[PDB]
């Protein structure tokens, strides 16, 4: 019995929670007590790790919400809206909801840059935007994707560096200091998820039945193509250590891979097609969101 099977099996019986809408995103706060934000339908639910009911709700109380993502200090949530808005929610519940307008279609991807005071958005208008929070305005637009921009990752370390994935089958790497993408890689299926490793030198792309790992320092050299899912790969996650990659799929499985070998070291089965996957600090909680509106929460033994 491998040390990996021992590690990833070391969870209690799952707790199933009904969200009564497809769970499009789950994100853990990086700050104690590591609450998680659940995006479904037109609102964001906050749960405590052991909550079976939401402890807070954030919403415009309008249209479908997308991609609710904590800032690195756990103090703001950024989200997109169906009507083409980017929203910031103050987690304290003290300050008014802030709205950035400019996108002309649904915004499915938002992230904070490393500096914490800029946002990267991607929309169904095919465009990528860089927003200055303090100046309350767009500073850059990139019109290089030719189809919906459905996923995105700002560098953990570099405030200038960020990536987006598109249904145009490409991932584009952008530097805030230049007006055109620095690199483009052909995932070759519609891109549903991306990950940038902290160095910026390795990028993971997921979509169709494929997970692909790219060396971006080497001009976007393909390191490996993984075909371990039977249906669309919908989500990517790193383990707390950065030493494991997790993928979730409409095929109801989460695969865990070594970041050294890219061999599968564990497999988990879920009741329904997976849309979202999130791991708490030191992997103490694993949350999977599915198409039938149910969250599966696993607590570490």
């Amino acid at each position: 019995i491998t040390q990996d099977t021992l590690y990833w099996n070391n969870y209690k019986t799952p707790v199933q929670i009904k969200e009564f809408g497809a769970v499009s995103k789950v994100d853990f706060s990086p700050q104690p007590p590591y609450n998680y934000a659940v995006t479904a339908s037109s609102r964001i639910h906050i749960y405590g790790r052991y909550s079976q009911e939401p402890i807070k709700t954030f919403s415009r109380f309008k249209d479908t919400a997308y991609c609710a993502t904590f800032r690195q200090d756990g103090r703001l949530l950024v989200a997109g809206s169906e009507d083409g808005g980017v929203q910031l929610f103050d987690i304290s519940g003290r300050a008014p909801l802030r709205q950035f307008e400019g996108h002309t279609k649904a915004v499915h991807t938002v992230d904070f840059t490393a500096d914490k005071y800029h946002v990267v958005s991607g929309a169904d208008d095919y465009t990528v935007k860089l927003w200055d929070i303090p100046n309350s305005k767009e500073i850059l637009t990139f019109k290089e994707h030719s189809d919906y921009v459905r996923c995105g990752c700002a560098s953990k370390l570099n405030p200038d560096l960020f990536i987006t994935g598109s249904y145009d089958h490409t991932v584009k790497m952008f530097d805030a200091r230049t007006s055109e993408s620095v690199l483009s890689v052909e995932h070759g299926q519609p891109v549903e998820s991306v990950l940038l490793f902290p160095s910026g030198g390795l990028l993971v792309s997921a979509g169709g039945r494929y997970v692909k790992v790219w060396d971006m320092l080497k001009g976007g050299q393909l390191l490996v193509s993984l075909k371990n899912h039977h249906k669309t790969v919908t989500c990517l996650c790193l383990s707390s250590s950065g030493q494991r990659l997790l993928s979730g799929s409409l095929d109801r499985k989460v695969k865990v891979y070594s970041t050294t070998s890219y061999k599968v070291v564990h497999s988990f089965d879920y009741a329904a097609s997976i849309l979202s996957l999130a791991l708490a600090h030191e992997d103490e909680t694993i949350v999977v969101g599915m198409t039938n509106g149910i969250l599966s929460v696993k607590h570490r033994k």
Side-chain angles (χ1 to χ4, degrees), residues 2-5 7-52 54-93 95-142 144-155 157-179 181-283 285-301:
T2 65
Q3 194 158 313
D4 268 306
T5 317
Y7 186 83
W8 295 106
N9 269 341
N10 195 38
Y11 293 82
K12 301 179 186 161
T13 303
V15 178
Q16 274 62 342
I17 305 169
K18 307 150 175 296
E19 269 282 329
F20 299 117
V23 181
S24 77
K25 183 143 184 194
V26 180
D27 198 52
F28 273 94
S29 178
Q31 297 304 328
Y34 314 119
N35 299 326
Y36 60 96
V38 178
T39 311
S41 191
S42 57
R43 84 283 156 147
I44 306 157
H45 283 149
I46 311 306
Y47 294 85
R49 271 183 293 169
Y50 279 114
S51 298
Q52 298 182 11
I55 63 169
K56 191 153 195 138
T57 299
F58 297 93
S59 188
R60 293 207 304 159
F61 298 96
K62 288 171 173 161
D63 58 351
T64 304
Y66 298 111
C67 200
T69 306
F70 285 96
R71 197 166 76 175
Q72 295 93 330
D73 61 354
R75 279 167 175 256
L76 294 191
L77 284 169
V78 65
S81 71
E82 183 59 33
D83 65 2
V86 174
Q87 292 85 46
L88 302 167
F89 299 91
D90 151 27
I91 276 307
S92 79
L97 180 279
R98 284 182 277 167
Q99 300 219 48
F100 301 162
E101 299 184 327
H103 284 294
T104 61
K105 299 281 183 290
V107 178
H108 290 250
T109 187
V110 288
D111 203 6
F112 292 105
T113 62
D115 58 279
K116 301 199 260 85
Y117 294 102
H118 303 74
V119 167
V120 175
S121 66
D124 286 4
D125 62 18
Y126 310 168
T127 75
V128 175
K129 287 178 180 292
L130 186 60
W131 309 92
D132 178 321
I133 295 324
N135 287 295
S136 301
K137 68 176 177 167
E138 165 189 329
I139 57 168
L140 274 166
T141 296
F142 300 91
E144 287 185 36
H145 289 298
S146 63
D147 202 344
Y148 296 166
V149 188
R150 285 288 180 94
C151 61
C153 194
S155 165
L157 292 184
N158 188 344
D160 289 320
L161 189 69
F162 55 93
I163 64 176
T164 55
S166 174
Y167 287 181
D168 75 5
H169 314 125
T170 77
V171 179
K172 291 187 192 310
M173 180 172 272
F174 295 101
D175 186 320
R177 291 182 270 91
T178 71
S179 61
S181 61
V182 292
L183 277 176
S184 194
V185 297
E186 176 71 21
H187 187 69
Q189 290 294 287
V191 187
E192 308 284 6
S193 183
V194 293
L195 247 50
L196 194 63
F197 279 86
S199 73
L202 288 190
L203 178 152
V204 187
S205 57
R209 292 184 62 192
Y210 296 86
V211 178
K212 289 182 183 174
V213 184
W214 305 91
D215 188 310
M216 304 306 286
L217 289 188
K218 281 169 132 181
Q221 166 176 143
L222 182 71
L223 302 182
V224 64
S225 184
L226 311 171
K227 192 168 175 156
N228 300 102
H229 290 289
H230 285 116
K231 305 184 171 205
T232 309
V233 184
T234 53
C235 49
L236 296 168
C237 202
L238 285 188
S239 66
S240 57
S241 80
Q243 293 207 127
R244 298 284 175 271
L245 175 66
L246 295 80
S247 63
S249 174
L250 301 183
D251 79 356
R252 309 182 186 170
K253 313 298 215 316
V254 173
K255 301 295 196 193
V256 188
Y257 317 83
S258 163
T259 59
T260 302
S261 67
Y262 285 107
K263 292 176 181 207
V264 180
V265 296
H266 194 72
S267 201
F268 305 101
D269 315 83
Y270 287 89
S273 292
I274 302 164
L275 295 179
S276 43
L277 168 60
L279 272 55
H281 168 87
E282 283 166 1
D283 305 324
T285 306
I286 303 173
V287 180
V288 161
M290 286 163 275
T291 50
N292 56 359
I294 107 89
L295 301 166
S296 171
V297 187
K298 289 178 185 174
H299 296 114
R300 226 184 137 75
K301 277 183 156 80

